[PDB]
Design a protein around this nucleic acid. Structure first.
Lengths: 114, 38, 56, 122, 209
RNA sequence: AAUGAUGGCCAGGCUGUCUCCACCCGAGACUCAGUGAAAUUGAACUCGCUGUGAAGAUGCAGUGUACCCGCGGCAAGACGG
RNA sequence: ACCGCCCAAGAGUUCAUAUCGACGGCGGUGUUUGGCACCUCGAUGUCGGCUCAUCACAUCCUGGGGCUGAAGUAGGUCCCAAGGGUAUGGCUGUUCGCCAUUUAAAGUGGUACGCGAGCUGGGUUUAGAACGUCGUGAGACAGUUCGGUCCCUAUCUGCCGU
């Protein structure tokens, strides 16, 4: 284990934001459009988190004007440039698989504004 | 090009060539005139 | 699902040739009373690694 | 990821809400094809006064499959439901005139450049 | 440039500057050693016998001690011949550097694969399944028919039969290059070498050119 | 009309029925101890390939190949029971 | 029987073998429909589906190559060439078949019309009951529809690993 330990001890991200399983999340993932680069939003909640270091995860659940295109990010892949928080969530458990089918008028959860 | 047991001369310009052991047909007049023993 | 012809006498031995038993012969000799005891086993007097454990 | 008779929603203004996978294009045995895959399928319904009628058959230019879409870091933008956008026989392009909902940038090559002109999303 | 093989450290996904992902093999190779002459001169074919690694003082046995004593060398984990390619040519006893993969652009992997014991035939060869219902008679995974009838009536040699597979040497050649650290003696490669993790697998510059 | 563990077809819901299978928990299968069976059985030191023959060869002619003996599996053949 | 080929009416606008052919002629293979009854009736389980195959080559695409009434293209024909490859659904037990739509393309044949001590049984040869028809009946129909029991703990050969 002490082999890659120094290898990738220098490849995990540098300044990741605040979330919970159910905190609102948006991974600005630099994607291919035309001939220039820009940032495009993917704002959502975490339903599923992986505290695994570089190969870990922090989950974003958007709503794509009715049908989303769902994303399993790498927090520590530089393809995730950064995260900018709009609000965190109030969660109990570890994995918010419920965040999906929960929609429209009730789809909300309050802010865990503490 | 024609292969059968029946090979013969057909026009004025050919050479039925024994190229080894099976009879043949060539043409030096027309492309149609080529055969071998069968 | 059966033999079709009855096997010979001699074969039966060879099939039995590897099943021969193997002797231990690696006796270990203790340092307190010298009672023969298996290496790594408390003696019949319940001794191993030399000392009187338990007590029976 | 559209296979024989795949449940199919429609992203377009043609009226047909119905399509169903029956033959993939581009090479024999081509099994799991989606994203930007074109395949043979048949229409099973339309809107009352639409440009297609019950029974008309066509292929597909996909924009959604329940499998979502991979991206440079191994990341994926994943589809919730299998909703799609058909194609012409000769002119290609979805037989319709107004399309809605997620497509895939993987369909971006100036051949489906028609749609990429004015979409709400991708 | 002979190949260099290591202990299958493990693996990683190597992260880059512009969104590049490189899940790479992780392997250990110490300063290698060629330990003998093989060629025309003493055998008539040319090869370079090589041991690498170390051994605990007490366990270097006298003849092998002499083998290394005659060698006068530290113990290494094993002696390998590199067949001399008319530019390849070594003699006993040298402790080696790794620069021999300066460019390579592709190397090998050959060694004991993951332990599996009797793997199932379904996995060894990608066979098919029968249906799980409508009267299946206890045949959810059998191989099915294998051979013909009163005609040749014998089983062709080589027939792919289920059984133990893997957990053994496995040559993996013509393999793209990703990265190394000579200063650390790792080998980190897009694509991960066979075997059990921690294994040695023959990594050699490409033989498919 | 109502009825039917009745015959045939078409909608809705559903989901590992399938493209295509992955993992996990239980009871056997494997090693050690003790007890301890059946169908079957001219006799056998019991290889492949061409050909010939009460006309589809382990056992014939010519011809290739192969150190002695186990253990876990598989089911083409022994016109297998 | 099939394919193959021999003759040259004739055709083919020309030109009997660009590509066809009268009437007649001589072969090859042994796969269709056939004959004969030498072996099996003190038991050699029938149609078809499913998994896994394998070779021949009278060559389907690819490869080569020639020629062509083969401009590019796309054909037609002849010689070489057997490494690799070779669709998904609906309709009926079906094979067959037909059809919808794809692709380089959906080659032809042997192997007990491969394969049940690896699976199924929907069809075809048992007992129930029906209709048409046929006889006085008993019942028949090779005419049609509904229902209906499948065993093996692997000695030897062989083959995969150890």
């Amino acid at each position: 284990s002490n082999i890659i330990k120094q290898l990738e001890q220098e490849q995990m991200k540098q300044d990741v934001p605040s979330f919970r399983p159910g905190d609102t999340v948006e991974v600005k993932v630099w994607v291919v459009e035309g001939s220039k680069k820009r940032l495009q939003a993917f704002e959502g909640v975490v339903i599923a988190i992986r505290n695994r270091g570089l190969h870990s995860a922090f989950t974003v659940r958007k709503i794509s004007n009715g049908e989303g295109v769902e994303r399993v990010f790498q927090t520590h892949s530089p393809v995730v440039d950064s995260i900018s928080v709009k609000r965190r969530g109030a969660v109990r458990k570890a994995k918010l698989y419920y965040l999906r089918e929960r929609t429209g008028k009730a789809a909300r959860i309050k802010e865990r504004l503490n | 090009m024609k292969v059968r047991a029946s090979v013969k001369k057909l026009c004025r310009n050919c050479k039925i060539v024994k190229r080894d052991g099976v009879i043949r047909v060539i043409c030096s007049a027309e492309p149609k005139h080529k055969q071998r023993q069968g | 699902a059966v033999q079709q012809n009855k096997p010979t006498r001699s074969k039966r031995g060879m099939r039995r040739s590897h099943d021969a038993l193997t002797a231990v012969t690696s006796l270990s000799v203790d340092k307190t009373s010298g009672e023969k005891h298996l290496r790594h086993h408390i003696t019949a007097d319940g001794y191993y690694r030399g000392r009187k454990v338990i007590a029976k | 990821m559209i296979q024989e008779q795949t449940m199919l929603n429609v992203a377009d203004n043609s009226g047909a809400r119905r399509v169903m996978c029956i033959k993939v294009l581009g090479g024999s045995h081509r099994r799991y094809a989606g994203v930007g895959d074109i395949i043979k399928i048949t229409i099973k319904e339309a809107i009352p006064r639409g440009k297609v009628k019950k029974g008309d058959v066509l292929k597909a230019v996909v924009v959604r499959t329940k499998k979502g879409v991979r991206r440079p870091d191994g990341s994926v933008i994943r589809f919730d439901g299998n909703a799609c956008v058909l194609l012409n026989n000769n002119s290609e392009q979805p037989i319709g005139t107004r399309i809605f909902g997620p497509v895939t940038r993987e369909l971006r090559s100036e051949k489906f450049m028609k749609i990429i002109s004015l979409a709400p999303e991708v | 440039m002979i190949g260099l093989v290591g202990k299958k450290v493990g693996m990683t996904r190597i992260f880059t500057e512009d969104g590049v992902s490189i899940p790479v093999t992780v392997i250990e190779v110490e300063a290698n050693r060629v330990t003998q002459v093989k060629d025309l001169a003493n055998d008539g074919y040319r090869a370079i016998q090589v041991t690498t690694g170390a051994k605990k003082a007490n366990r270097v046995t006298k003849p092998e001690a002499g083998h290394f004593a005659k060698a006068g060398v530290e113990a290494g984990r094993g002696l390998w011949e590199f067949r001399l390619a008319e530019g390849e040519e070594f003699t006993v006893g040298q402790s080696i550097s790794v620069e021999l993969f300066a460019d390579v652009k592709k190397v090998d992997v050959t060694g004991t694969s993951k332990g599996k014991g009797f793997a199932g035939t379904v996995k060894r060869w990608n066979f098919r399944t029968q249906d799980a219902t409508h009267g299946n008679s206890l045949s959810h995974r059998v191989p099915g028919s294998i051979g013909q009838n009163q005609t040749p009536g014998k089983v062709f040699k080589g027939k792919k039969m289920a059984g133990q597979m893997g957990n053994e040497r496995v040559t993996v050649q013509s393999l793209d290059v990703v990265r190394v650290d000579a200063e650390r003696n790792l080998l980190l490669v897009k694509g991960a070498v066979p075997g059990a993790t921690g294994s040695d697998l023959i990594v050699k510059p490409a033989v498919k050119a």
